Amino acid sequence: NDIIAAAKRMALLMAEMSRLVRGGSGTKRALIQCAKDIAKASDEVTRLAKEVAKQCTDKRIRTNLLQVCERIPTISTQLKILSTVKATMLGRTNISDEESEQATEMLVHNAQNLMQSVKETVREAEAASIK
Amino acid sequence: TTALVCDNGSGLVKAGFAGDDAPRAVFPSIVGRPRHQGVMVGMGQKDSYVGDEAQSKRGILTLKYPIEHGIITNWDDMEKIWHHTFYNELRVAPEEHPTLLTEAPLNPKANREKMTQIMFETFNVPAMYVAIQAVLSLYASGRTTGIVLDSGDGVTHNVPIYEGYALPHAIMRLDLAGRDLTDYLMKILTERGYSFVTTAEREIVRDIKEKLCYVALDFENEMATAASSSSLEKSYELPDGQVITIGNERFRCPETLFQPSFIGMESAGIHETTYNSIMKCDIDIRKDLYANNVMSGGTTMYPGIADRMQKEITALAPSTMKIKIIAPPERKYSVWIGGSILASLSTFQQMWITKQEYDEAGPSIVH
Amino acid sequence: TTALVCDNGSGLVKAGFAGDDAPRAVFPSIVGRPRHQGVMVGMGQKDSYVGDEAQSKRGILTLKYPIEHGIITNWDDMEKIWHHTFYNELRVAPEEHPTLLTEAPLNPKANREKMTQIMFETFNVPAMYVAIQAVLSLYASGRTTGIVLDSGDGVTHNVPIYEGYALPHAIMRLDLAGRDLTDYLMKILTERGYSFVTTAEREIVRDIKEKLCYVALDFENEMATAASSSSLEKSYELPDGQVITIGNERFRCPETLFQPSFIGMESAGIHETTYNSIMKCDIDIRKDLYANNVMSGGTTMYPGIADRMQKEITALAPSTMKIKIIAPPERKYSVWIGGSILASLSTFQQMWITKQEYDEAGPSIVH
């Protein structure tokens, strides 16, 4: 089941992202690449969720699956943008530690919202696989 | 293999396969559509949110229970409860298991028919049985004699049963409890400035109906001792940081089950409907209905019962007639632990309604 | 090729194509006619100078901000703003690509219609959409919930959004900041013996609002330490070399946004207007408007906030309530970094006002 495979891949990347955000200035390039890799996996979940929805035999489950998966593009796009912002704050000539910490908290929060939407997408995908 | 015990709760629908221990899924059944407009874009939101998530995301919806006075308001929302629950919670297809559904003891026709009929054509179930929630609470309480109390928001009942037959000439249905007790609690916390005038916000009141409220042992002396300086008032904390202090009303609200004068409804109290149903049965049987008074439902988990209920019956009852009140642990799941015993039993597998027999026979099989 | 995000700033109009870094063209909206007689005899100069040239030639012009009280003076100067940005800065025609335009959260009708209508007939864009500046700042903030503060010279706003619905009854419009902070700064800079009452020269005052002003942690105690013999004065330099020494007034001017009594106007401060929007929303949501407080606009980039804002709110807020008010760097471009995410996404490619619908149905259902 390639949605479950993508979701487990995303979880392993999110475990690596968790390790990277606890580091110092040395995790800068790794953190940007991790976010890029997570966004690539989220696009695969969205593509597969639409395909599973097409193959499903009930309008209601299909509608719910389309509703939840359509937020994944906007949140994954915000993760890519917020990663560019955080990149320009790391190593900046004058920047506050409190502002850096709040940017990290926002980035983790956005990742948590993306993961929660994918978690709900998995629940509806499991339900869609019945019919 | 194993059948499914699915209880069509008053509250508080319960679902789990047959046995062994406690229900796998319990949920409040509420649907709420979003009254406000979306600006995040997509829309990316569900058309109506079911529970649990409609109790984790309140105040942006208008919560509507699908069951109103023990009858389904529309099967359009009900079928959606069922579909959501079976598919994205339990993760089961209704065609895999013969099922067990529940109803109320005294309820309007064609509520059990329309249910059975729609559920067979929509979900394509292979076999079904429909049991009343009260009868199942006997098996859960390990007995076959006694008057059974299935008390939920918003229909309570008082059904007398004697080893091992039902007495039809003494059956009582009260619509007095429990959502009207919720609505009354909301009116007397509004009386101390704690405003909860909207449908969704009423749910928080229902949670405060669980924990803070209790049954007084003696009303008149608790009213006296409430006027005394030492506190019976408790300070609650609210999601926006607010502190709510309730005290006098705290023991008044559950007492309503004995005293319907608080509501302003004429319907007789549980005290008197218990007594008046026993004293409508034949003389010899009355002997064994006493001391087999069996409670059930989540609404009987209050402190101060059963020895208020006991003392009130013992005060009206004849001389040296002993009353014991049968209280199971964790009464909210009593009905479900009942259902598990029924659908698992042999030889009663052939007293189910199976799809092939049902096609020729029609809904005349149900009743 | 790609769509174009042009943000109708209060200040400070901002323009740049869809993504990926920072705006291409920014200027402080000023148009200025030449107020002195010519002796160059061609004459060979612009009829009225726009920015940057109207910020390069102060003292020979009369600067006129074309947007005041959040509404534009005339579309005769506004079209000239647009024409200059698209043609002699960006080097583009809107005929090639759909645009994205912005407006204010609360303004008079039919000024968004008239804008949309004039821009379709003059510049002949094939599709358009008009977004409020606050909603776009959600995308930029990385959040799906929170109260959005878009504060520019001269209209600030307070819009609450909850996952991800708008809360209509709680939206607050303050005309309190920022051109009135500029005007107040000019009256207490008059206290240090320099003349700034003239229209062009008012821009120099605005620049001293950017760099020099700072927000005190507590007014009464910063006033205490001002009385000390240890200096609190900072030396500013004026364009022809003059030295202005401001100290006390430096923290007096921003304090105005907490205390409107300094202006002598009657509207309530950011302090109470923050609270009053939360306390007109339903109980369950009130928890999560807290800690998702997002500031925006260039006028909020003082380092004395957010821990002033924190200390003021934390004093009025209930006990043990989550408070996180720290805002993103570079708030002046927040809206634009928002706009880029929106107009690039599907499904909302199909939520633009198309030319075919504009011709057939006019500016129906714009807001």
Ligand SMILES: Nc1ncnc2c1ncn2[C@@H]1O[C@H](COP(=O)(O)OP(=O)(O)O)[C@@H](O)[C@H]1O
């Ligand atoms: N500790 C408690 N004290 C009082 N009421 C309770 C308690 N726990 C649960 N309840 C009530 O139990 C109700 C649910 O009753 P339930 O047993 O589900 O009815 P039913 O048997 O008919 O399905 C809820 O509405 C709730 O108010």
Ligand SMILES: Nc1ncnc2c1ncn2[C@@H]1O[C@H](COP(=O)(O)OP(=O)(O)O)[C@@H](O)[C@H]1O
């Ligand atoms: N460092 C700063 N401190 C305070 N004010 C600033 C600073 N930098 C810019 N500003 C102010 O920001 C204003 C522009 O706000 P802006 O964000 O453009 O409003 P808007 O979002 O509504 O277009 C200017 O008028 C300027 O005075």
Ligand SMILES: [Mg+2]
């Ligand atoms: Mg019940």
Ligand SMILES: [Mg+2]
């Ligand atoms: Mg703005």
